Amino acid sequence: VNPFSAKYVPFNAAPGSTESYSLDEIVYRSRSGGLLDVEHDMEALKRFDGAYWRDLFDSRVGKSTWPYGSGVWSKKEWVLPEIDDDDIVSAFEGNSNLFWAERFGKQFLGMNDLWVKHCGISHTGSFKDLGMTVLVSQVNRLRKMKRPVVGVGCASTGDTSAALSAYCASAGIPSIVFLPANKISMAQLVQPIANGAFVLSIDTDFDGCMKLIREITAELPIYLANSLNSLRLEGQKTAAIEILQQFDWQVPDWVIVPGGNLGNIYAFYKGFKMCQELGLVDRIPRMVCAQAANANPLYLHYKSGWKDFKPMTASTTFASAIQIGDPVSIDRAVYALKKCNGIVEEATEEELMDAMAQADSTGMFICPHTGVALTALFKLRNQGVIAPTDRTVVVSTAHGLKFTQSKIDYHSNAIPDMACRFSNPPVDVKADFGAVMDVLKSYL
Amino acid sequence: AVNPFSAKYVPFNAAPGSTESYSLDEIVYRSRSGGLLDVEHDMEALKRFDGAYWRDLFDSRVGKSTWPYGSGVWSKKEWVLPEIDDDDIVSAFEGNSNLFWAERFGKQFLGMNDLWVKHCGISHTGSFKDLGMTVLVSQVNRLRKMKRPVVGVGCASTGDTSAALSAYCASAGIPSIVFLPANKISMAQLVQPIANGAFVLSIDTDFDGCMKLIREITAELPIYLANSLNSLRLEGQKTAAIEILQQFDWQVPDWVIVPGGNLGNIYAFYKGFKMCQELGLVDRIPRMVCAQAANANPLYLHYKSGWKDVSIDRAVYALKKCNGIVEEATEEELMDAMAQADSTGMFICPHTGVALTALFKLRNQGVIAPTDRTVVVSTAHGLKFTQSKIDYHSNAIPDMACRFSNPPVDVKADFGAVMDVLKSYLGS
Ligand SMILES: C[S@@+](CC[C@H](N)C(=O)[O-])C[C@H]1O[C@@H](n2cnc3c(N)ncnc32)[C@H](O)[C@@H]1O
Ligand SMILES: C[S@@+](CC[C@H](N)C(=O)[O-])C[C@H]1O[C@@H](n2cnc3c(N)ncnc32)[C@H](O)[C@@H]1O
Ligand SMILES: C[S@@+](CC[C@H](N)C(=O)[O-])C[C@H]1O[C@@H](n2cnc3c(N)ncnc32)[C@H](O)[C@@H]1O
Ligand SMILES: C[S@@+](CC[C@H](N)C(=O)[O-])C[C@H]1O[C@@H](n2cnc3c(N)ncnc32)[C@H](O)[C@@H]1O
């Protein structure tokens, strides 16, 4: 009855390799120690032409029918084809606004066809929801199959844990979060705490919590939620399919994604590539990966001609989730960027904050990581690589509501060594009709 | 404009042969007698199309990419602002918000299998105000583009309304002004209008000093005011009710619980459900519960008095018509409810905590049955109220037990210690 299936496979598998694993297998790496990927049965999917898939996926966008209302699960056949609908844990994720940045594109970039994907408008406020619905759904299934998974554990700065904990909580799955004691107080770990996660405050840095969550997982029947998981990528790749669908199956010229551990940027390529390969569309977009100057291993690797990649030491950024020294999905990203003929650009602490301020002025509320992405767009316009007329999509990874402090400090002119050129502080005036009118007429 | 549909400003009531009405193109805030204004649609022009027509029309637009019908508000454009040009609309894909099924929360805490929470907080600016602001700003945009004298939009909100207002205005290139007392200025509270390029004024006076001053400016400069009295924002807000129906495949819930501070909201929801009933989409409206804080005004005391002793009359009318109920929630009760809800996956606002407390109390009274289809409206994303959650979960709210707090446990970087803590948790 159900002809579609998926399995684990070594990332970029060698010719005629026989290595595969059932998705029910709890595995994170291959025989060689490399990363795993979800490989779908392309022979079975190709029994249906692009016309069928377009019509099928279109018939399901924003409908009440479970589970196809979700931006991810409307594409179930391409994500987890063999999961039962009873096991799916979904919070209506995806269907995210592809915001037309008319005033930003025209006033700053000379662009008419610039769009911003607001992935931040989600259940936990970041794109990580797309990935967590797939992972927790699969974990949910394993639990019901009486498999040894008593909960999910992770150690990541808010964004990953918030998504995980929320989805785990709704399904009654215990969620275990390891976080450094002083390094984050209680402000940014509010979501997992509120979502009934079992939170531990450890006497170490972020690195020490990452090491300890491994040790725990080695003995305890606790599933490990990491950058490694190819399941998360299966949900995240639907954002690329969604962008296509929102453009009525027309392919944009450029897509710019913030790259931390570099999984997301790869997920986007896989989504775009899958639509081309199955006959939905005839082409794929060119991709741009944007990084913070304080954490630019991919940037240094690209401009060296895809030769010599080095795990650099990352320094403090306002774009917290993007500051990664040794990116886990590095080989994935490099592969993706080569195939789609892509580009990598960096962004300084000042440049990412300024581009963020300029975006907000157009009626947005986007994260510092998005500022990084917009900086890349700024620079590629300068270099003439992105044309003023080209259909360009910038991916906003998180809502600004999760990164308010960086905005409060910027407009308060309270960041040391920062120029804060686009700050918009409140103006002081005494209760006088003439004085109030004059400052308003000057703004008029 | 071969458009059969139309709407106008009309007083809320005035039975004895009133002919008072204003064009939606006029700047007006109140009636001749000072009462509330109301957007009245040409129901006779709408009644020309049967219940099935509107259902199928609204269903065909939902989620789609066709401008402007993708929005949860503008998908019902004919019922909101029928005369505005598509090229004048300022939309940020608002509405379409998750009708989250509270399975774990409903079954474990309330013994309810069909309880839903409507997450309006998942939107552009983090609240349901986006629904109302898209209509207001669109009209203001329409007026400005036809060379009408409107220099900008102003308000005195420190929270949701100003955040929503300034965001929509910024995209349309419409100046946004926030009049506020210099002492009540908060950098955190105003983070959204500040970033959205809104002209925020800090005035060296009190609450009354500002309201007196705005009167003096709006008599000289034509600044459109956004406030609680505004009836144009209700036209957007009402589509949330319509949406709830559409999301249930045009099946009416038994109960819809709305937080009530402003009191305009509960009316908007009533207005939306009623419009669907009156036009043949459905055969009924839900019973509604208005949930108020214990600290809040005497709407609760008025309901308990058997309807004998802003937007107060507006809400009382809506509640009497739909056979509604009002309940209170105390500071501790709403915080507890927020914690319980949150622990099951949600991340809701304190206003939603108030609504859930009203649900709890009415379940205990046996007014709401276990099987009853119940929708609890969440007005704002929990991310706008992290400080109260931080305080609650660290037991840092005085005169409150914080009984459902989930503080993190302290451990050193020792394997055996981390394990023993984990073992006792997994043993539970
Ligand atoms: C209210 S349910 C319809 C009633 C349901 N079929 C029943 O029998 O109880 C449909 C709504 O659930 C919410 N929802 C959340 N996740 C969804 C998903 N993955 N697929 C479809 N709807 C989802 C959406 O807001 C959607 O409008
Ligand atoms: C994106 S507009 C482009 C307008 C103009 N040709 C330009 O380039 O500046 C193209 C079509 O999309 C629709 N549209 C207008 N504003 C939109 C928005 N903010 N988001 C999505 N679609 C929009 C309109 O129906 C219009 O016909
Ligand atoms: C990408 S535009 C369609 C292209 C457009 N016809 C053009 O030629 O430029 C459609 C997307 O804009 C966004 N959007 C925001 N508001 C919308 C609205 N009111 N109606 C339709 N789409 C809207 C949604 O994310 C939607 O998927
Ligand atoms: C409300 S669910 C299950 C109700 C069940 N009779 C009970 O009381 O436990 C009814 C239908 O809605 C769909 N559904 C399941 N989970 C959903 C969710 N989280 N959101 C929206 N619809 C859902 C499924 O297709 C299911 O058959």
Ligand SMILES: *Cc1c(COP(=O)(O)O)cnc(C)c1O
């Ligand atoms: C995790 C995260 C990123 C980084 O994505 P990768 O796939 O790890 O490159 C960027 N922005 C936000 C908001 C994130 O949470």
Ligand SMILES: *Cc1c(COP(=O)(O)O)cnc(C)c1O
């Ligand atoms: C929410 C609301 C208000 C109050 O908004 P705040 O900015 O939070 O004070 C007033 N009137 C109506 C109709 C509302 O919906």
